[PDB]
Design a protein around this nucleic acid. Structure first.
Ligand SMILES: [Mg+2]
Ligand SMILES: [Mg+2]
Ligand SMILES: [Mg+2]
Ligand SMILES: [Mg+2]
Ligand SMILES: [Mg+2]
Ligand SMILES: [Mg+2]
Ligand SMILES: [Mg+2]
Ligand SMILES: [Mg+2]
Ligand SMILES: [Mg+2]
Ligand SMILES: [Mg+2]
Ligand SMILES: [Mg+2]
Ligand SMILES: [Mg+2]
Ligand SMILES: [Mg+2]
Ligand SMILES: [Mg+2]
Ligand SMILES: [Mg+2]
Ligand SMILES: [Mg+2]
Ligand SMILES: [Mg+2]
Ligand SMILES: [Mg+2]
Ligand SMILES: [Mg+2]
Ligand SMILES: [Mg+2]
Ligand SMILES: [Mg+2]
Ligand SMILES: [Mg+2]
Ligand SMILES: [Mg+2]
Ligand SMILES: [Mg+2]
Ligand SMILES: [Mg+2]
Ligand SMILES: [Mg+2]
Ligand SMILES: [Mg+2]
Ligand SMILES: [Mg+2]
Ligand SMILES: [Mg+2]
Ligand SMILES: [Mg+2]
Ligand SMILES: [Mg+2]
Ligand SMILES: [Mg+2]
Ligand SMILES: [Mg+2]
Ligand SMILES: [Mg+2]
Ligand SMILES: [Mg+2]
Ligand SMILES: [Mg+2]
Ligand SMILES: [Mg+2]
Ligand SMILES: [Mg+2]
Ligand SMILES: [Mg+2]
Ligand SMILES: [Mg+2]
Ligand SMILES: [Mg+2]
Ligand SMILES: [Mg+2]
Ligand SMILES: [Mg+2]
Ligand SMILES: [Mg+2]
Ligand SMILES: [Mg+2]
Ligand SMILES: [Mg+2]
Ligand SMILES: [Mg+2]
Ligand SMILES: [Mg+2]
Ligand SMILES: [Mg+2]
Ligand SMILES: [Mg+2]
Ligand SMILES: [Mg+2]
Ligand SMILES: [Mg+2]
Ligand SMILES: [Mg+2]
Ligand SMILES: [Mg+2]
Ligand SMILES: [Mg+2]
Ligand SMILES: [Mg+2]
Ligand SMILES: [Mg+2]
Ligand SMILES: [Mg+2]
Ligand SMILES: [Mg+2]
Ligand SMILES: [Mg+2]
Ligand SMILES: [Mg+2]
Ligand SMILES: [Mg+2]
Ligand SMILES: [Mg+2]
Ligand SMILES: [Mg+2]
Ligand SMILES: [Mg+2]
Ligand SMILES: [Mg+2]
Ligand SMILES: [Mg+2]
Ligand SMILES: [Mg+2]
Ligand SMILES: [Mg+2]
Ligand SMILES: [Mg+2]
Ligand SMILES: [Mg+2]
Ligand SMILES: [Mg+2]
Lengths: 386, 63, 109, 183
RNA sequence: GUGAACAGCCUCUAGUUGAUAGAAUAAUGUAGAUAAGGGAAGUCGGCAAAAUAGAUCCGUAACUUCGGGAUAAGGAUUGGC
RNA sequence: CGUGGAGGUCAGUGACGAAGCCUAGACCGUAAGGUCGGGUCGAACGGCCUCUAGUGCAGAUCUUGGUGGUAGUAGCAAAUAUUCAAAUGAGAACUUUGAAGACUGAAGUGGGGAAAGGUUCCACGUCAACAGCAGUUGGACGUGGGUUAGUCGAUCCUAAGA
RNA sequence: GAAAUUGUUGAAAGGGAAGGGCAUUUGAUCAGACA
């Protein structure tokens, strides 16, 4: 008949279907445009989401009421031990799209990745790559022509890297394997780089720097079967209504005589792939560095790990990326940090932050103390102690 | 084995509700044979069925 | 083979009963323990001593103590041959408090 | 006797029956079929597992709005169940077959279940009282169960016909030649 | 026993412990609760819900058939020893 | 063309298998139908000329009986609540006994009665059906036992009324 | 001891119904007529 009152539809049709992702590891749908003038490097990085804390910093924003004043800001921390490079994979252009034509693998493969190739490690004979590993033997001949062929053809080159999950409090023990586009120099220079980095190791500082704008690709936390009200942000129907009220009252007109794809319906909520962009790196931490959590202004020797340790995660004993704000996914989930697809100028992007203080009190409650030392100071001797 | 009849009989001979007759689980054969009031009477006499004490309701706080 | 052992454990009933409905807590305890014995003695057959029952229901359905010190005994089975030759008896150990004890073996003779 | 269609060698088979059994016809139909053709010994151990909930019975006909279980993967199926009363009636008749088989003097190691057939015994009426004064039939669906165990036997040899060939004057002349020509 | 009390709530005597069961805790329900700031803007309509309440003391308007209206309204107090 | 029954006839068919029923076997007929084979079966039946009618079904929200899909689906969610062990038994979540945890809370889930029921009481045996899971239990099934009055009622008296 | 309806066995077909008409291929099956 015509609405009555106009109101915007509930929820975005660009995030359909609202099904469960095909995997925990969200896919990198797109890599940055290649500029073959610059050196070879990764264009993304694997990590694990540890947790969140607070930051204090002066603000550099002429014109703003808060120029030259402190602000407090939430941040996420993702555990980021060096990634290890075990393969190169070379794609060619076709009128049917990009197709892979070979993969060359490292001679030796950490049990971690090998574990990924299996569904029952303990029972297995662990025979993975054992014949491939041979290929190196004979002078190299066969591996060479594979590198060679990548170079001859291939419009793009990706590396095969994986995570050193053992350097991580997780139980999960089976590592994460993934393709990172290489975006440095010429095709040949690319594969050379890869070949050189077989069984060799790469760290975030070689791909991210302070104040850089990055994106995060991950699978969203899960919530199971969700009624229409919370899943689409539909009105609660009045208290008086029979047969329940977290619903849509009208599921469609009488014609088209079909429920339509565009109305809200109960169903899976969360465990979705998201590619969420513009997260500024506020810190790139080093694992072999006490005073991880310390600052030019703070100076106390302490690492980022909160008292009692990251709730539901653990300790952070590796390099981390600290990113302003929050990020898709949850504590313990694999997560891809990615180089941005454009060169932002934003002013907001470009600001060169410099932390003043990183919160480090217990997240497991109303944390009153940064360190056990501070806690001793304030409290005095207890019936335990010396 | 089914001693409800004896337990009922027990309650009446003794003068007390069934909630307080004790049928000795180890004398379960001997008890079953007791079909009469006279038989239960003997079984009470020698400890095979005992009266079981009243649950106390103390007036000490009321005092 | 077999083995025949007696050890004394303490079981955290608290985290196992956490969440459970009040009219199900003492009953859950019974089950939860049974499952605890089987995880340790490997034995399907698990019998609970009538005294252990009392220990458990000692404060009514929803008042189960957070920690019970038990003694589990893996024993051989007799008569009409059950599925498995082995079984566990569980019993309460009379202890001032069940707080603070690691698990011990009972040298049996 | 007079069982259903069988193709088997009666001299090397034993049989068993139950009639009018208060088990669900639909359920024990499904559980009889998970056994059909099985090696007797593998089948008996199988039912035993079903009861332990370690393998399931695949429901393939009477199964709409059944649950789902990983225990049906082994049979390429998503819906499967663990019909206790059905299992225990069927494994009851199975035991009987074995006994009869032992009596006939048949190698108990070659025994497979070659026939297994449930169908429908007469129904049995109780009634339920419905709202507003009404009555509904509340009914048992009992079953007849029948099975036959036969001893596996190898081979089959050959032999059949000889196909009598019929060639025209031009067909047997080319043949007459072909060889007069070459080999 | 508490209490004004044959109320509610706990108990002795007596009697029951019968009501398919197990495992989980998605949506939506039924039944039971709570919510910052605002406070009827919701709705035909305060529907539903919330608020009030016992006892002692103080204080109590219009109007009236002088009997009421009246626990009007409005306040303070209340344990243990 | 086809059915039930009747007069006539073929000295018709048949326990060496009548009738009926089954049969993606055969044959005649444009068709209603007719014929045969094989299997099943068990006592009667058919061609031809006539006579006769309670004579031919897809329907009537047709009548009676039977049967499906729905479907192993809706469901078996009110009355706070159950637990350990033993015994018995082919079999025990549910029977008996012991222990424990509770409940009804004397306006009772206690102890008796009036109307009504009619053996349900009680013992022994006992599970095919019944108790919308179960069952060794039962108000079930089988076989028995059991109700004692000068004083308790009736009986007597009168009431509305008959 | 029909039918509806059901179990098994054997054979066959099945990309949002199935069944039907004229026609032929293929498979299975079968009558007759020949001397
Ligand atoms: Mg408009
Ligand atoms: Mg999938
Ligand atoms: Mg190749
Ligand atoms: Mg919700
Ligand atoms: Mg909203
Ligand atoms: Mg939201
Ligand atoms: Mg709505
Ligand atoms: Mg309404
Ligand atoms: Mg916290
Ligand atoms: Mg909870
Ligand atoms: Mg039969
Ligand atoms: Mg069907
Ligand atoms: Mg069906
Ligand atoms: Mg279902
Ligand atoms: Mg359903
Ligand atoms: Mg469906
Ligand atoms: Mg399926
Ligand atoms: Mg009903
Ligand atoms: Mg009625
Ligand atoms: Mg030739
Ligand atoms: Mg009573
Ligand atoms: Mg009920
Ligand atoms: Mg339930
Ligand atoms: Mg509020
Ligand atoms: Mg206000
Ligand atoms: Mg208004
Ligand atoms: Mg107002
Ligand atoms: Mg309005
Ligand atoms: Mg109005
Ligand atoms: Mg209005
Ligand atoms: Mg109201
Ligand atoms: Mg309030
Ligand atoms: Mg007034
Ligand atoms: Mg005072
Ligand atoms: Mg005629
Ligand atoms: Mg006629
Ligand atoms: Mg007639
Ligand atoms: Mg036919
Ligand atoms: Mg013919
Ligand atoms: Mg014949
Ligand atoms: Mg005949
Ligand atoms: Mg005869
Ligand atoms: Mg005529
Ligand atoms: Mg007529
Ligand atoms: Mg017609
Ligand atoms: Mg008809
Ligand atoms: Mg019709
Ligand atoms: Mg018609
Ligand atoms: Mg009809
Ligand atoms: Mg009908
Ligand atoms: Mg069923
Ligand atoms: Mg159901
Ligand atoms: Mg209901
Ligand atoms: Mg029960
Ligand atoms: Mg109590
Ligand atoms: Mg009470
Ligand atoms: Mg009361
Ligand atoms: Mg009752
Ligand atoms: Mg009486
Ligand atoms: Mg009666
Ligand atoms: Mg009785
Ligand atoms: Mg029975
Ligand atoms: Mg009955
Ligand atoms: Mg029943
Ligand atoms: Mg039964
Ligand atoms: Mg009787
Ligand atoms: Mg009698
Ligand atoms: Mg008198
Ligand atoms: Mg008299
Ligand atoms: Mg017959
Ligand atoms: Mg065919
Ligand atoms: Mg044709």
């Amino acid at each position: 008949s015509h609405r009555k009152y106009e109101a915007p539809r509930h929820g975005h049709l660009g995030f359909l279907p609202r099904k469960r992702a095909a995997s925990i590891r969200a896919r990198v749908k797109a890599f940055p445009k290649d500029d073959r003038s610059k050196p070879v490097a990764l264009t993304s990085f694997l990590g694990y989401k540890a947790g969140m804390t607070t930051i204090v910093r002066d603000l550099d924003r002429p014109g703003s009421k808060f120029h030259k004043r402190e602000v407090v800001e939430a941040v996420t921390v993702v555990d980021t031990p060096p990634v290890v490079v075990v393969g190169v994979v070379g794609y060619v252009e076709t009128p049917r799209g990009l197709r892979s034509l070979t993969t060359v693998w490292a001679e030796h493969l950490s049990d971690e990745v090998k574990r990924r190739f299996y569904k029952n490690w303990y029972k297995s004979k662990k025979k993975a790559f054992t014949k491939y590993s041979a290929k190196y033997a004979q002078d190299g001949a066969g591996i060479e022509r594979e590198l060679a062929r990548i170079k001859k053809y291939a419009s793009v080159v990706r590396v095969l890297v994986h995570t050193q999950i053992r350097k991580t409090p997780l139980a999960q023990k089976k590592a994460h394997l993934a393709e990172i586009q290489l975006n440095g120099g010429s095709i040949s220079e690319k594969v050379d780089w890869a070949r050189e980095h077989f069984e060799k190791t790469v760290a975030v500082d070689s791909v991210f720097e302070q104040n850089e704008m990055i994106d995060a690709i991950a699978v969203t936390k899960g919530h199971g079967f969700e009624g229409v009200t919370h899943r689409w942000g539909t009105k609660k129907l009045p208290r008086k209504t029979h047969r329940g009220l977290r619903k849509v009252a009208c599921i469609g007109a009488w014609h088209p005589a079909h429920v339509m794809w565009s109305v809200a319906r109960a169903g899976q909520r969360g465990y979705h792939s998201r590619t969420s962009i513009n997260h500024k790196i506020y810190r790139v931490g080093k694992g072999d560095d006490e005073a991880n959590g310390a600052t030019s202004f703070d100076r106390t020797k302490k690492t980022i790990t909160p008292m009692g340790g990251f709730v539901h995660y653990g300790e952070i004993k590796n390099d981390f990326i600290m990113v302003k704000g929050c990020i898709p996914g949850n504590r313990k989930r694999i997560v891809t940090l990615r180089k941005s697809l454009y060169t932002n100028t934003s002013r907001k992007a470009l600001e060169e932050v410099s932390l003043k203080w990183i919160d480090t009190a217990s997240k497991f409650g109303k944390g009153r103390f940064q360190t056990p030392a501070e806690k001793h100071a304030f409290m005095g001797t207890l019936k335990k102690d010396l | 084995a089914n001693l409800r009849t004896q337990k009922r009989l027990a309650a009446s001979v003794v003068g007390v509700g069934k909630r307080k007759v004790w049928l000795d689980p180890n004398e379960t054969s001997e008890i079953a044979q007791a079909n009469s009031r006279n038989a239960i009477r003997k079984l009470v006499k020698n400890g095979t069925i005992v009266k079981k004490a009243v649950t106390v309701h103390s007036k000490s706080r009321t005092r | 083979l077999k083995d025949v052992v007696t050890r004394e454990y303490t079981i955290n009933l608290h985290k196992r009963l956490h969440g459970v409905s009040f009219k199900k807590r003492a009953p859950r305890a019974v089950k939860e323990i049974k499952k605890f014995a089987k995880l340790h003695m490997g034995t399907d057959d698990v019998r609970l001593a009538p005294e252990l029952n009392q220990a458990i229901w000692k404060r009514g359905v929803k008042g189960v103590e957070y920690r019970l010190r038990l003694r589990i005994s893996r024993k051989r089975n007799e008569e009409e041959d059950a599925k498995n030759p082995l079984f566990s008896y569980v019993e309460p150990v009379l202890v001032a408090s069940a707080k603070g004890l690691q698990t011990v073996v009972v040298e049996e003779d | 006797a007079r069982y259903g269609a069988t193709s088997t060698n009666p001299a090397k088979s034993a049989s068993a029956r139950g009639s009018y059994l208060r088990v669900s016809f639909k359920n024990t139909r499904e559980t009889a079929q998970a056994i059909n053709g099985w090696e007797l010994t593998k089948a008996q151990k199988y039912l035993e597992q079903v009861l332990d909930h370690q393998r399931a019975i695949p429901f393939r006909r009477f199964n709409s709005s059944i649950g789902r279980t990983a225990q049906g993967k082994e049979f390429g199926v998503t819906k499967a169940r663990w019909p206790a009363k059905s299992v225990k009636f069927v494994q009851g008749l199975l035991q009987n077959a074995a006994a009869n088989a032992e009596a006939k003097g048949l190698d108990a190691t070659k025994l497979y279940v070659s026939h297994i057939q449930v169908n429908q015994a007469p129904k049995q009426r109780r009634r339920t009282y419905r709202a507003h004064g009404r009555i509904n039939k509340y009914e048992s669906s009992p079953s007849h169960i029948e099975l036959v165990v036969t001893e596996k036997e190898e081979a089959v040899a050959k032999a059949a016909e000889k196909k009598v060939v019929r060639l025209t004057s031009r067909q047997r002349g080319r043949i007459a030649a072909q060889k007069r020509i070459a080999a």
